[PDB]
Design an enzyme around this catalytic site. Structure first.
Site, PDB file in Angstrom:
ATOM      1  N   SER A  78       0.807  -1.220   0.139  1.00 18.55           N
ATOM      2  CA  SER A  78       0.110   0.023   0.034  1.00 18.55           C
ATOM      3  C   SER A  78       0.954   1.238  -0.188  1.00 18.55           C
ATOM      4  O   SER A  78       0.219   2.253  -0.241  1.00 18.55           O
ATOM      5  CB  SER A  78      -0.749  -0.072   1.155  1.00 18.55           C
ATOM      6  OG  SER A  78      -2.122  -0.813   0.972  1.00 18.55           O
TER       7      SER A  78
ATOM      8  N   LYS B 289       0.192   3.772  -2.631  1.00 20.60           N
ATOM      9  CA  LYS B 289      -1.028   4.543  -2.702  1.00 20.60           C
ATOM     10  C   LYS B 289      -0.316   6.052  -2.723  1.00 20.60           C
ATOM     11  O   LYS B 289      -1.430   6.913  -3.350  1.00 20.60           O
ATOM     12  CB  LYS B 289      -1.868   4.170  -1.772  1.00 20.60           C
ATOM     13  CG  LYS B 289      -2.531   2.797  -2.033  1.00 20.60           C
ATOM     14  CD  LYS B 289      -3.410   2.233  -0.951  1.00 20.60           C
ATOM     15  CE  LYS B 289      -3.851   0.955  -1.336  1.00 20.60           C
ATOM     16  NZ  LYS B 289      -4.153   0.003  -0.312  1.00 20.60           N
TER      17      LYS B 289
ATOM     18  N   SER C 114      -6.145   3.400   3.494  1.00 18.49           N
ATOM     19  CA  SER C 114      -5.394   2.213   2.570  1.00 18.49           C
ATOM     20  C   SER C 114      -6.332   1.545   1.909  1.00 18.49           C
ATOM     21  O   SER C 114      -6.299   0.414   1.616  1.00 18.49           O
ATOM     22  CB  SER C 114      -4.479   1.451   3.550  1.00 18.49           C
ATOM     23  OG  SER C 114      -3.534   0.950   2.650  1.00 18.49           O
TER      24      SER C 114
ATOM     25  N   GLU D 150      -5.175  -3.755  -7.038  1.00 18.85           N
ATOM     26  CA  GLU D 150      -5.679  -4.588  -5.757  1.00 18.85           C
ATOM     27  C   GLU D 150      -6.645  -5.733  -5.864  1.00 18.85           C
ATOM     28  O   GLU D 150      -7.735  -5.656  -6.487  1.00 18.85           O
ATOM     29  CB  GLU D 150      -6.130  -3.570  -4.662  1.00 18.85           C
ATOM     30  CG  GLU D 150      -5.030  -2.330  -4.294  1.00 18.85           C
ATOM     31  CD  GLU D 150      -4.168  -2.803  -3.490  1.00 18.85           C
ATOM     32  OE1 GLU D 150      -3.966  -4.089  -3.022  1.00 18.85           O
ATOM     33  OE2 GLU D 150      -3.200  -2.082  -2.791  1.00 18.85           O
TER      34      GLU D 150
ATOM     35  N   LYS E  75       2.649   6.624   5.113  1.00 23.86           N
ATOM     36  CA  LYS E  75       1.860   5.482   4.459  1.00 23.86           C
ATOM     37  C   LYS E  75       2.464   4.089   4.923  1.00 23.86           C
ATOM     38  O   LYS E  75       3.539   3.735   4.322  1.00 23.86           O
ATOM     39  CB  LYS E  75       1.776   5.725   3.092  1.00 23.86           C
ATOM     40  CG  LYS E  75       0.875   4.652   2.282  1.00 23.86           C
ATOM     41  CD  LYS E  75      -0.795   4.965   2.516  1.00 23.86           C
ATOM     42  CE  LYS E  75      -1.450   3.697   2.065  1.00 23.86           C
ATOM     43  NZ  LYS E  75      -1.142   2.749   3.191  1.00 23.86           N
ATOM     44  N   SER E  76       1.741   3.480   5.464  1.00 24.28           N
ATOM     45  CA  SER E  76       2.162   2.228   5.734  1.00 24.28           C
ATOM     46  C   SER E  76       1.768   1.195   4.596  1.00 24.28           C
ATOM     47  O   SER E  76       1.049   1.562   3.682  1.00 24.28           O
ATOM     48  CB  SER E  76       1.431   1.541   7.087  1.00 24.28           C
ATOM     49  OG  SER E  76       0.075   1.592   6.781  1.00 24.28           O
ATOM     50  N   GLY E  77       2.470  -0.243   4.697  1.00 23.63           N
ATOM     51  CA  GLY E  77       2.031  -1.164   3.792  1.00 23.63           C
ATOM     52  C   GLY E  77       2.046  -2.532   4.507  1.00 23.63           C
ATOM     53  O   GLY E  77       2.849  -2.682   5.508  1.00 23.63           O
ATOM     54  N   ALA E  78       1.163  -3.579   4.053  1.00 23.50           N
ATOM     55  CA  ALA E  78       1.363  -5.018   4.459  1.00 23.50           C
ATOM     56  C   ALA E  78       0.917  -5.726   3.246  1.00 23.50           C
ATOM     57  O   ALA E  78       0.185  -5.579   2.591  1.00 23.50           O
ATOM     58  CB  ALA E  78       0.373  -5.222   5.653  1.00 23.50           C
TER      59      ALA E  78
END
Length: 263
Positions: free
Chosen positions: A45, A48, A105, A141, A209-212
């Site tokens: 993510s 984004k 997200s 996605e 901004k995080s992602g997983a």
């Protein structure tokens, strides 16, 4: 600082996986620390932010308007769509979609925005044209989170992501208004609580901004600094670990703690 690199090494050992890391001075653009800077990691993510960067560029050029309303249907809704699932009847504006994509997200929001710019190929072309010939988005996605080992699809390097983020937030590409909007969305992040934010002293600024994703993939990109103003960009990625989400979170927070300590 050297001991931050030790913390990153600690994290590799305890996660049983690769960790990529960059600390970049926001004003000068000088790389202060790095680890695996030229190695690829799945963006998850974190893409984004780049996505809404491309949208804002189109807004600047008049090809897009932030108030334009997009309608969509039940079948557009993919996994993890906490905002978009609530607006089947009324639709959402482009601005609302980027808000959902960055602060929450939201996955369907990201797909709708991708459609507005012409898809993953056109996001990559956007990045290419601003001087990032490394980062690539290939899928939508949620498939882009697959993180197949050695698959280069939907990846970036820590160095490429860090310098691209700096260009978006503080470079010549976007108008002042669009730069401010992009960082405002990132400051409003609601889904990166246990990460860098957990190490952040009172009064500090952070926009992130995080992602997983699959196969232990986890990461964060951020502009942060003391006295309520960002002054550095931090990028952290890992993939491949079999560790729990919670351990992966704690490792990133711990790297964050070291970064802050030795600021």
């Amino acid at each position: 600082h050297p001991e931050t690199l030790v913390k990153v090494k600690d994290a590799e050992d305890q996660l049983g996986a690769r960790v990529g890391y960059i600390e970049l001075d926001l004003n000068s653009g000088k790389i202060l620390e790095s680890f695996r800077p030229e190695e690829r990691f799945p963006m998850m993510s974190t893409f984004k932010v780049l996505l809404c960067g491309a949208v804002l560029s189109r807004v600047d050029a008049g090809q897009e308007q932030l108030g334009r309303r997009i309608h969509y249907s039940q079948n557009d809704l993919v996994e993890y769509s906490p905002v978009t699932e609530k607006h089947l009847t009324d639709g959402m504006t482009v601005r609302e979609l980027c808000s959902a994509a960055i602060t929450m997200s939201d996955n369907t929001a990201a797909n709708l925005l991708l459609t507005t710019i012409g898809g993953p190929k056109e996001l990559t072309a956007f990045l290419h044209n601003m001087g990032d010939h490394v980062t690539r988005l290939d899928r939508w996605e949620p498939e882009l989170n697959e993180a197949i080992p050695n698959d280069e699809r939907d990846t970036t390097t820590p160095a490429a992501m860090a310098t691209t983020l700096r260009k978006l937030l503080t470079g010549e590409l976007l108008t002042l208004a669009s730069r401010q909007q992009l960082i405002d969305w990132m400051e409003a992040d609601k889904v990166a609580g246990p990460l860098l934010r957990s190490a952040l002293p009172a009064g500090w600024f952070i926009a992130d901004k995080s992602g997983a994703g699959e196969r232990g993939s986890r990461g964060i990109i951020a502009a942060l600094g003391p006295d309520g103003k960002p002054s550095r960009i931090v990028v952290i990625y890992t993939t491949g670990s079999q560790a729990t989400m919670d351990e992966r979170n704690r490792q990133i927070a711990e790297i964050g703690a070291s970064l802050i300590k030795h600021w």
